[PDB]
Every structure is written in structure tokens, then in C-alpha cells.
Paper text:
MM_0014 from the methanogenic archaeon [name] is known as a versatile cis-prenyltransferase that accepts both isopentenyl pyrophosphate and dimethylallyl pyrophosphate as acceptor substrates. Cis-prenyltransferase (cPT) generally catalyzes the consecutive head-to-tail condensation of isoprene units and produces (Z,E-mixed)-polyprenyl pyrophosphates. MA1831 and MM_0014, which are orthologous cPTs from the methanogenic archaea Methanosarcina acetivorans and [name], respectively, unusually accept both IPP and [name] as prenyl acceptor substrates. The overall structure of MM_0014 is in a ζ-fold, which is similar to those of so far reported cPTs.
The FG-complex crystals of MM_0014 (designated as “co-FG”) were soaked with [name] for 39 min to elucidate the binding mode of [name] at the prenyl acceptor-binding site, because the recognition of [name] as the prenyl acceptor substrate is required for the head-to-middle condensation. As a result, surprisingly, by replacing the FG ligand, two [name] molecules were found bound to four of the eight protein molecules in the asymmetric unit. [name] molecules were accommodated in both the prenyl donor- and acceptor-binding sites, and a Mg2+ ion was coordinated between the pyrophosphate group of [name] at the donor-binding site and the α-phosphate of [name] at the acceptor-binding site. These [name]-binding subunits were all in a closed conformation. In the other four protein molecules, FG and pyrophosphate were still bound in the donor-binding site, while a Mg2+ ion was coordinated between the pyrophosphate and α-phosphate of another pyrophosphate that was bound to the acceptor-binding site. The [name]-binding protein molecule formed a dimer, either alone (one of four dimers in the asymmetric unit) or with an FG-binding protein molecule in an open conformation (two of four dimers). The remaining dimer consisted of two FG-binding protein molecules, while only one subunit held an inorganic phosphate at the acceptor-binding site in a closed conformation. The distance between the C1 of [name] at the donor-binding site and the C2 of [name] at the acceptor-binding site, which corresponded to the C-C bond-forming atoms in the head-to-middle condensation catalyzed by some cPT homologs, was 4.3 Å. This distance seems somewhat long, which could be why this structure could be solved without the complete processing of either a prenyltransfer or a hydrolysis reaction. The interaction between the C-terminal sequence of MM_0014, TLGG, and the substrates of prenyl condensation reactions seems weak; only the main chain nitrogen of Gly223 and the hydroxyl group of Thr221 likely coordinate with the acceptor substrate [name] in the [name]-binding structure.
Residue numbers in the entry:
A (entry chain B): -2 to 219
B (entry chain A): -2 to 143, 150 to 214
Write the structure that this text describes.
């Protein structure tokens, strides 16, 4: 991308989850229409990707859109779907192992992303980039209750089973909440909230989240 | 006044979750042994109860201890279990509808609390007080094998509106994965035994500021 001065970290998370929230508030604050913020969320994702590749983060999961989000106005649904498609396509121009997880048994799921619903190497690969597209926490848990008979097997067979435990979850837009992102993988996740809206992303947001992470005692109830 | 005037709130959560974390760090900071913090966590719980009753909170769920917590040394297990028993027994002397949710199929689950594993009205009731005792997220979700989502072990406990965690960590530690999917989370930096009413007031000011 371009040259940065990235701090040195004593400890790095294996898996970062990103909640790129605040697109509508960002747009309204700039006197744009609510749905116009999503198109300004793509370059921030690429800056996150570039930083994570440079420091050697193993896996990053981006919250794209939920089944609940598809209750919003058509004009917003078209805007955030278009922006999610573009984000996956942009990572597909770089070096990544791409996975899209979400309900593909829905008219809402974009045909453009079906090819990424199995993990796909692009360029030199290495870093795992996941996207949650038409994802729902209820759909994810209930996927298991149907397609797993046993109980101990249920957990291993949730819809998002390819996505491992989230070490660090970073949420833009100043809300401290999961919005149903990966309930199983996020039970022990250390959560960092950035007050600025996602389109106002700065590398310093990610650096401060990583400083937060390396400062945590990760005890897992022990 | 002696006790801070309880502020008047323009919005209130129906259901507050409490994670009373930091007992061991609190004890170690005082030069006590790791296990000596838990007994100093009981009165804070009663202060939360008193304030929630006064402002008219419908439901409060306390995180007591988890299956993961039973990995800890036996001296710590006995100390936190003893403190959880005493907490429920103290609420049992007041006005509450008490429910204990947790894995009762374990010699770790205290016999004293079996009677509260069905919702129990004490005094005038009018507030629902839940305790998670030998609770595990994994046990909760997998319990359904006993519609499946509506038959999780914690199914009686509704959506958490506001989650307040003491001890400075911003994490769920597996508290009620289903009910916490949209919960607004407020972290208090002070360890649970350093509870002050202003901790709770600031959490509720945070909640009424959320959209
Ligand atoms: C790696 C890259 C390139 C991009 C990652 C970011 C991304 C998915 C951008 C796409 C548009 C976007 C902001 C969607 C998020 O919207 C939801 C959250 O608030 C629902 O409204
Ligand atoms: C009372 C209670 C169950 C607290 C949760 O924190 P924890 O210390 O048990 O977990 P963690 O190690 O994830 O902070
Ligand atoms: C499991 C439980 C009863 C949590 C309360 O604090 P703690 O025992 O986790 O103490 P700390 O967070 O300081 O280790
Ligand atoms: Mg939002
Ligand atoms: Mg703790």
C-alpha cells in the first residue's frame, strides 16, 4: 500500500475480529444520505489488511452484514451489499486466503461471493481474511442443531465452524456490543471500542487496540 | 445525604447483567491471599440489589462462577462457592424472585442452592434476581438436546439490555452467549470489592445515552 511506522508489539492476537460500524452516522455528519457511508468503508478495510499483513496477524474476520441488517431500507441494503462485494473483490486482488461465511440459501446472498464460500488462495496467500455476509448468530447456532445429532458434535458443526476463537475484537462507531458476531468464537474475546466511525479509520486505532490486547491477562477463567 | 442521591434516569434497561470480577487482584493488592477477596464481594452484590430495587429495574443476573472457574485450585473453589451460597441466602432474606441457573449434575454445585433452581418468590418479590452458579456457555447451548434454541439451559433468562463488568476487562467470559448478542457493555476499572453506587449510576447514564 504505502509506508507506515508500525510500533513493535510484545504480544499479537492470532485472530482479530473487526466490526466496521458507524457508516450511516459518518454520512449524516457530512450532510450525505445515510446509505452513502458504506462506499467510504472499503479503503479503511484495505489499510487494516495492509497493517495486519505487515505485522504478521494470522487471521482477520470482518463483520460485513447480518440477516437482521436486511430488515433496513432497500437503498441501504443495496449500498452495504455493493460495498461488501467490493471489499471481498479488493482483497481478491492481493495476497490472502479468503472465506465468506453466511446464509447462501437466500436471494439476499450476492452470487458474486459464492466462489469465496470455500477458503480460496489469492496471490501469495498466508493471511486468512474472513467476511460475514448475510450472517446471523441464530442461523449459525441452529445450523448445528439441524446438521449435528450428538451434542458435543453440535458445537463443532455451527455454520461458522471454519472460523476459530476470536482473540481481539475491535469495534468502530463507539458502541460496546457484539451485534451477534460469532457468539461461540467471542465468549472470551477482549473487546476494544474505537469512538470514531469506521470511515474515519486511522492506523493508530488498530495500534491502540493491539497495545490494549498485549496489556490483557488472558486467563480463560483460570 | 449519607448515601449519594439516586439520580432520576430518562431510560432504564429491563435486564442488567453483573460480572463481579477482580476479587483475586483486589485481595493481592491488599496483601491478602488470592482466595480472600470473595467474602468482600457479598455486600457489593446487596448494594447493587438495593439500588436496582429503588430505581425499579425489572431483572438482574449476577455471574457467580463458571465451569471454567472450577479449573482453579480447591482453596479458591471453596472460597468463591461459599461466597456465592451466602449471596443467594442474603437475597433470600429480602424481596426478590430468585432463580439459580447452572449445571446441578456436579459435586461442585452447592446443595444449598438446589432449592433456587426453580424461580422462588421471597418477601414482596417485584424484582427478578438470577445467579449463574457452575454455569458454562457450552453446557448452556448443548443442553437443548434435552425449538432447540428455546430449550437452552438459561431459556428462562431473557435478552440482557445492559452488562456491567467490574475489574477492568472488556469481555463476556462466556456469560449467556444467546442473551448478550446485542447487550450494551459498560466496564468499571475498579475491582468488584471496590464497588461504589457511582459505578452503577455511570453505567445507567451510559445506557440511556445509547441508541
Ligand atoms: C477488508 C475490506 C476491504 C473491508 C472490510 C470492511 C467492510 C466489510 C466494508 C464494506 C461496507 C461496510 C462498512 C459494511 C458494514 O456495515 C455493517 C456494520 O455496520 C452493517 O451496517
Ligand atoms: C464472576 C465471573 C464468572 C467472572 C468472569 O471473569 P473470570 O475471571 O471468571 O474470567 P476471565 O479469566 O475470562 O477474566
Ligand atoms: C471467578 C470469579 C468469582 C471472579 C471474581 O474475581 P476473580 O476470582 O476472577 O479475580 P481476578 O479477576 O482478580 O483474578
Ligand atoms: Mg450501526
Ligand atoms: Mg477474573
Amino acid at each position: 500500500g504505502y509506508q507506515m511506522d508500525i510500533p513493535k508489539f510484545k504480544r499479537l492476537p492470532r485472530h482479530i475480529a473487526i466490526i466496521p460500524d458507524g457508516n450511516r452516522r459518518w454520512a449524516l455528519a457530512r450532510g450525505l444520505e445515510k446509505h452513502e457511508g458504506y462506499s467510504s468503508g472499503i479503503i479503511p478495510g484495505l489499510e487494516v489488511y495492509d497493517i495486519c499483513v505487515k505485522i504478521g496477524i494470522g487471521e482477520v474476520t470482518f463483520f460485513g452484514f447480518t440477516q437482521d441488517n436486511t430488515k433496513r431500507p432497500q437503498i441501504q441494503r443495496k449500498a452495504f451489499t455493493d460495498a461488501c462485494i467490493k471489499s471481498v473483490q479488493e482483497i481478491a486482488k492481493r495476497d490472502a486466503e479468503i472465506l465468506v461465511v453466511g446464509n447462501t440459501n437466500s436471494d439476499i446472498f450476492p452470487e458474486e461471493l459464492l466462489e469465496y464460500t470455500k477458503r480460496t488462495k489469492v496471490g501469495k496467500g498466508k493471511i486468512k481474511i474472513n467476511f460475514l455476509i448475510n450472517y446471523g448468530w441464530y442461523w449459525d447456532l441452529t445450523y448445528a442443531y439441524d446438521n449435528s445429532p450428538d451434542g458435543k458434535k453440535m458445537i463443532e458443526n455451527i455454520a461458522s465452524a471454519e472460523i476459530p476463537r476470536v482473540d481481539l475484537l475491535i469495534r468502530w462507531g463507539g458502541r460496546c456490543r457484539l451485534s451477534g458476531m460469532l457468539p461461540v468464537q467471542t465468549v472470551y474475546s477482549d473487546i476494544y471500542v474505537v469512538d470514531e466511525m469506521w470511515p474515519d479509520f486511522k492506523p493508530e486505532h488498530l495500534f491502540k487496540a493491539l497495545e490494549f490486547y498485549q496489556n490483557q491477562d488472558i486467563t480463560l477463567g483460570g
